[PDB]
Ligand binder design. Structure first.
Ligand SMILES: Nc1ncnc2c1ncn2[C@@H]1O[C@H](COP(=O)(O)OP(=O)(O)NP(=O)(O)O)[C@@H](O)[C@H]1O
Length: 267
């Protein structure tokens, strides 16, 4: 990891909060950055988790993984400094830009996420918390995986819920949910079903229905991510390959899955 002197960092505005305190947008010496702090009194576990998050991110170098600019560890408060992503979290971004993108742009988002996830899985990093809220978006529409460190039911594979088995294949299940989030512009998975109702439906064999205006190939792919049997799910390499081929022959995306309407309008 690279150590940054505190005089090079200007915190400008609070943009959130997390397990360690405040998250800021600021400037680094001149580039915009996100800044997470850890204030005095932190416990040993907090310090281990905080610097461990920076340590994890420092091991990665990929277009679709948030870049670590550096850390402040020699001075207090300690800081993790990452590249600033101008459009913020993908979940909120989609909901605030409903219907504004082409299908090709949405599928390109998913290809980027999948490439980041393929890299993580091949680096032997299991994310455990993959969801549109944990992906960030820049001014080139590039989606990058965030949320690293040492989890809601409706994003999580059945084996991870049932017996705590988190692997790259449970991340594939989560990626299928992310596909559904992207293609619906941030709809809430399973709508108002409770967590227990979601698990019951999944065990009964039910799956999320196709989004409106969704390419058939894209819905088929998300359905395969939701195989109950972990070994039958695609690997991230398979997902990247398929998405690449669909993007390279974009007419393949014009064939849409049938949408099941909830409402009848007779005229
Ligand atoms: N690099 C970044 N660029 C732009 N926004 C960021 C960046 N990193 C974090 N944020 C935003 O900062 C806020 C909280 O940071 P986040 O990484 O989500 O921490 P968290 O502990 O997960 N907080 P929450 O998600 O609120 O529990 C959210 O708006 C994040 O999307």
């Amino acid at each position: 990891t690279t150590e940054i002197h505190p005089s090079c960092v200007t915190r400008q505005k609070v943009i959130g909060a997390g397990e360690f305190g405040e998250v800021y947008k600021g400037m680094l010496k001149e580039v915009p950055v996100a800044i997470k702090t850890l204030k005095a009194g932190y416990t040993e576990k907090q310090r281990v988790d905080f610097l461990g998050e920076a340590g994890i991110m420092g091991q990665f170098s990929h277009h679709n993984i948030i870049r670590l600019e550096g850390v402040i560890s020699k001075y207090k408060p300690m800081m993790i400094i990452t590249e600033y992503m101008e459009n913020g979290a993908l979940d909120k971004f989609l909901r605030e830009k409903d219907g504004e993108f082409s299908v090709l742009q949405l599928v390109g988002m998913l290809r980027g996420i999948a490439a980041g996830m393929k890299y993580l899985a091949n680096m032997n990093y299991v994310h455990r918390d993959l969801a549109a809220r944990n992906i960030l978006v820049n001014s080139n529409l590039v989606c990058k995986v965030s949320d690293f460190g040492l989890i809601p039911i409706r994003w999580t594979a059945p084996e991870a819920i049932s017996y705590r088995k988190f692997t790259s294949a449970s991340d594939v299940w989560s990626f299928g949910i992310v596909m559904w989030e992207v293609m619906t512009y941030g709809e809430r998975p399973y709508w108002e079903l409770s967590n227990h109702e979601v698990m019951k439906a999944i065990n009964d064999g039910f799956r999320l229905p196709t989004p409106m205006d969704c390419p058939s190939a894209i819905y088929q792919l998300m359905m395969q991510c939701w195989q109950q049997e972990r070994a039958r799910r695609p690997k991230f390499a398979d997902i990247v390959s398929i998405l690449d081929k669909l993007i390279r022959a974009p007419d393949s995306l014009k064939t849409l899955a049938d949408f099941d309407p909830r409402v009848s309008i007779r005229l």
